[PDB]
Amino acid sequence: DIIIATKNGKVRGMQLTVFGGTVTAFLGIPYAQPPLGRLRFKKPQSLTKWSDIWNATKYANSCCQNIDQSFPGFHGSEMWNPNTDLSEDCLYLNVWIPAPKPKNATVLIWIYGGGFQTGTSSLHVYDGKFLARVERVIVVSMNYRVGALGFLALPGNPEAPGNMGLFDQQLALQWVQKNIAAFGGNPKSVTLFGESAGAASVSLHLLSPGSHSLFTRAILQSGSFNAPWAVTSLYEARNRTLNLAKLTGCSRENETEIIKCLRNKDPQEILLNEAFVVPYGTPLSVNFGPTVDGDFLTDMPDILLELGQFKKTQILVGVNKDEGTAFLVYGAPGFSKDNNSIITRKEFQEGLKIFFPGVSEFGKESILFHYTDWVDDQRPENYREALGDVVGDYNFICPALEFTKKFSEWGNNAFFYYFEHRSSKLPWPEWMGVMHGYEIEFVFGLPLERRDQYTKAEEILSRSIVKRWANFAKYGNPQETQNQSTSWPVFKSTEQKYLTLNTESTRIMTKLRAQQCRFWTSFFPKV
Ligand SMILES: *[C@@H]1O[C@H](CO[C@@H]2O[C@@H](C)[C@@H](O)[C@@H](O)[C@@H]2O)[C@@H](O[C@@H]2O[C@H](CO)[C@@H](O)[C@H](O)[C@H]2NC(C)=O)[C@H](O)[C@H]1NC(C)=O
Ligand SMILES: *[C@@H]1O[C@H](CO[C@@H]2O[C@@H](C)[C@@H](O)[C@@H](O)[C@@H]2O)[C@@H](O[C@@H]2O[C@H](CO)[C@@H](O)[C@H](O)[C@H]2NC(C)=O)[C@H](O)[C@H]1NC(C)=O
Ligand SMILES: *[C@@H]1O[C@H](CO[C@@H]2O[C@@H](C)[C@@H](O)[C@@H](O)[C@@H]2O)[C@@H](O[C@@H]2O[C@H](CO)[C@@H](O)[C@H](O)[C@H]2NC(C)=O)[C@H](O)[C@H]1NC(C)=O
Ligand SMILES: CC(C)(C)C[NH2+]C[C@@H](O)[C@H](Cc1ccccc1)NC(=O)C(c1ccccc1)c1ccccc1
Numbered sequence: 027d028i029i030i031a032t033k034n035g036k037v038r039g040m041q042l043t044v045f046g047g048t049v050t051a052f053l054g055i056p057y058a059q060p061p062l063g064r065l066r067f068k069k070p071q072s073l074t075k076w077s078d079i080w081n082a083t084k085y086a087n088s089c090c091q092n093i094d095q096s097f098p099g100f101h102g103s104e105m106w107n108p109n110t111d112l113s114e115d116c117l118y119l120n121v122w123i124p125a126p127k128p129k130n131a132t133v134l135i136w137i138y139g140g141g142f143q144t145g146t147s148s149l150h151v152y153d154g155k156f157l158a159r160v161e162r163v164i165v166v167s168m169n170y171r172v173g174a175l176g177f178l179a180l181p182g183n184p185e186a187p188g189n190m191g192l193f194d195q196q197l198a199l200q201w202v203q204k205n206i207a208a209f210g211g212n213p214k215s216v217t218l219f220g221e222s223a224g225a226a227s228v229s230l231h232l233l234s235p236g237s238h239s240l241f242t243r244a245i246l247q248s249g250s251f252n253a254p255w256a257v258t259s260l261y262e263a264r265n266r267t268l269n270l271a272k273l274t275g276c277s278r279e280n281e282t283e284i285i286k287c288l289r290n291k292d293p294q295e296i297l298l299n300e301a302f303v304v305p306y307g308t309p310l311s312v313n314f315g316p317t318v319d320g321d322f323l324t325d326m327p328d329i330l331l332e333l334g335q336f337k338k339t340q341i342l343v344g345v346n347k348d349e350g351t352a353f354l355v356y357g358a359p360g361f362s363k364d365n366n367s368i369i370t371r372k373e374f375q376e377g378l379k380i381f382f383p384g385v386s387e388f389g390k391e392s393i394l395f396h397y398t399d400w401v402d403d404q405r406p407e408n409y410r411e412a413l414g415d416v417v418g419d420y421n422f423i424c425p426a427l428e429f430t431k432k433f434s435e436w437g438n439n440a441f442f443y444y445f446e447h448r449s450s451k452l453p454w455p456e457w458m459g460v461m462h463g464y465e466i467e468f469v470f471g472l473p474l475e476r477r478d479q480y481t482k483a484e485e486i487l488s489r490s491i492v493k494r495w496a497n498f499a500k501y502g503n504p505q506e507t508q509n510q511s512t513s514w515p516v517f518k519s520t521e522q523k524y525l526t527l528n529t530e531s532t533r534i535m536t537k538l539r540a541q542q543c544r545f546w547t548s549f550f551p552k553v
């Protein structure tokens with residue numbers, strides 16, 4: 027029985043058997059007073075000391091959120107759905123501690139994705155016990171508010187200022203600064219890592235001055251704030267805040283009076299109307315996302331990035347080979363996860379309309395022109411693959427590369443990876459390839475568990491990835507120095523070298539998606 031004295035009280039954990047060893051888990055430590063009642067839509071508020079022993083032995087409530095029901099019973103979609111009760115009382119974090127208790131361990135803080143509308147830290151694929159066991163780091167993860175409850179914006183109005191979920195993340199990094207030493211952890215050696223909107227979140231903490239002293243280094247898996255889906259304009263945010271008021275009968279003239287109205291509505295009523303605040307949306311639609319609030323974010327982040335206004339430190343950034351495919355089976359015509367989804371030119375063009383709704387006829391033709399120059403014109407999957415590349419290059423790969431270029435231009439070491447292994451346990455069909463989100467289990471070390479039917483080559487790939495992630499958090503340098511491994515070079519704006527991650531030949535390559543990204547990063551912003 028291990029009890030830890032934190033700043034606000036004692037917490038009891040629990041023991042776990044991992045690989046003939048022991049990890050100490052603290053699941054469900056509160057880090058803010060529950061944002062209920064008059065606290066809904068507001069920045070998170072500090073906790074009051076408890077004199078008893080807090081029992082942190084089970085994952086806490088997930089935050090309120092809509093669920094993906096597009097494939098009931100299918101593990102491929104449902105593995106991402108919340109696995110604890112939804113509740114507005116959801117501001118909790120988890121801590122995995124090596125046993126024996128470490129003395130000054132590096133801390134890894136995980137921030138989940140979910141498009142800022144969904145997600146939870148209790149997912150099986152986010153279990154931090156393998157990393158604590160195998161690398162003797164401490165793994166922390168937190169729940170943060172999501173959707174309207176986390177990102178509703180009336181700028182300047184502290185009843186609904188925006189970016190609340192980001193301030194939730196920040197208050198948990200805060201908790202680690204005040205408390206992780208009591209757990210054996212080094213508050214001066216804290217690496218943030220996250221995927222999808224979690225990675226975009228990590229990139230925004232690099233930008234937010236209030237977060238600059240709360241971490242050391244940063245890892246961005248398939249996401250960054252300059253991705254088109256990652257920041258909600260103040261224009262959209264107003265229209266979206268107002269439209270939500272209409273759909274709930276909360277339209278008022280006094281703006282603070284609207285919030286008070288929205289505070290009486292039941293959680294499900296806010297959730298149900300979230301989906302309709304956007305007239306024409308995409309499968310990627312971030313209804314309520316990060317905004318330029320003037321608090322967490324002082325200016326438009328493209329400007330801060332371009333002019334070097336961010337925390338100076340090392341970054342590790344990467345993307346997966348087929349980022350874009352997962353979104354095609356959520357609306358694109360001719361697509362299904364249950365067939366090979368051979369689409370025609372006309373279906374492709376219809377697909378562009380779904381993913382670029384408010385884009386001119388000429389914009390859509392330019393995408394078609396740039397992606398329909400086939401090496402062979404007789405390949406039937408030509409249009410199926412091109413639509414995936416469009417979505418993945420536009421929404422993920424090119425923004426990540428551009429983020430890495432601009433960030434490294436200010437003198438810091440950057441490392442970029444290209445993950446191209448398709449999991450042997452992947453429930454989605456083979457034509458979707460190396461999907462968005464399916465590097466996560468390798469980062470967290472799930473194939474290190476021999477019982478789990480991953481191949482041996484997958485064990486070795488995870489083992490190396492886990493070593494490189496830990497070496498990056500510990501020492502700023504994602505090498506595997508012992509076994510005779512390919513050395514990972516720094517990413518520089520001239521050479522743009524990156525490391526490929528796969529079971530076979532790990533290689534050094536240059537200028538990923540160069541032709542594709544000059545289209546998206548240089549030409550397409552004009553249309
Ligand atoms: C725990 O270790 C820290 C040092 O952490 C390292 O240095 C960081 C800058 C960063 O590079 C991390 O990834 C490293 O692991 C100790 O911090 C020092 O504490 C003394 C206080 O006596 C202070 O005078 C020094 O300035 C601190 N910084 C450094 C760089 O030495 C800390 O004391 C250690 N604590 C325990 C309990 O072991
Ligand atoms: C800004 O909002 C207006 C209206 O808000 C919502 O529109 C629908 C999505 C509905 O679900 C309700 O929440 C609100 O009425 C948008 O204007 C609508 O646009 C659609 C098509 O673009 C049109 O068919 C409707 O008649 C319009 N309704 C009104 C009242 O104008 C508008 O498009 C949003 N965006 C911008 C940039 O103005
Ligand atoms: C691949 O499947 C899509 C989706 O169709 C659904 O899923 C199938 C597996 C099957 O169970 C169908 O009954 C389902 O409707 C097919 O697209 C549909 O094609 C039909 C007939 O041409 C058309 O009426 C629908 O509008 C299409 N639906 C969508 C969402 O596009 C597609 O034709 C299949 N392609 C191949 C190569 O198998
Ligand atoms: C794996 C991950 C942790 C990333 C999420 N698990 C999948 C599921 O929970 C959520 C549900 C959702 C849907 C729409 C808006 C918000 C959330 N889907 C995504 O998060 C993802 C996406 C995948 C496929 C089809 C559409 C969307 C995305 C959404 C917005 C921006 C970028 C990616």
Ligand SMILES: *[C@@H]1O[C@H](CO[C@@H]2O[C@@H](C)[C@@H](O)[C@@H](O)[C@@H]2O)[C@@H](O)[C@H](O)[C@H]1NC(C)=O
Nearest residue numbers: 027028038039040041078079080081082083
């Ligand atoms: C918190 O937990 C206390 C201990 O209960 C037991 O603790 C360990 C040693 C395990 O055996 C565990 O499975 C047991 O449940 C309780 O005595 C205490 O009442 C609990 N407090 C609250 C508020 O629930």
Ligand SMILES: CC(=O)N[C@H]1[C@H]([C@H](O)[C@H](O)CO)O[C@@](O)(C(=O)O)C[C@@H]1O
Nearest residue numbers: 100102362363364365452453454455456
């Ligand atoms: C048709 C259906 O509902 N499920 C089928 C799945 C799906 O197509 C998955 O998305 C891809 O595993 O694929 C199988 O054929 C397969 O190879 O295991 C089994 C099953 O018949």
Ligand SMILES: *[C@@H]1O[C@H](CO)[C@@H](O)[C@H](O)[C@H]1NC(C)=O
Nearest residue numbers: 278279280281282283284286
């Ligand atoms: C709106 O209502 C709040 C609370 O009653 C009040 O403090 C504020 O001054 C009002 N503003 C306007 C413009 O009516």
Ligand SMILES: *[C@@H]1O[C@H](CO)[C@@H](O)[C@H](O)[C@H]1NC(C)=O
Nearest residue numbers: 486489490491493506508509
């Ligand atoms: C290096 O290889 C040995 C086998 O000789 C293996 O046990 C170990 O886990 C490997 N280390 C890494 C970091 O992959």
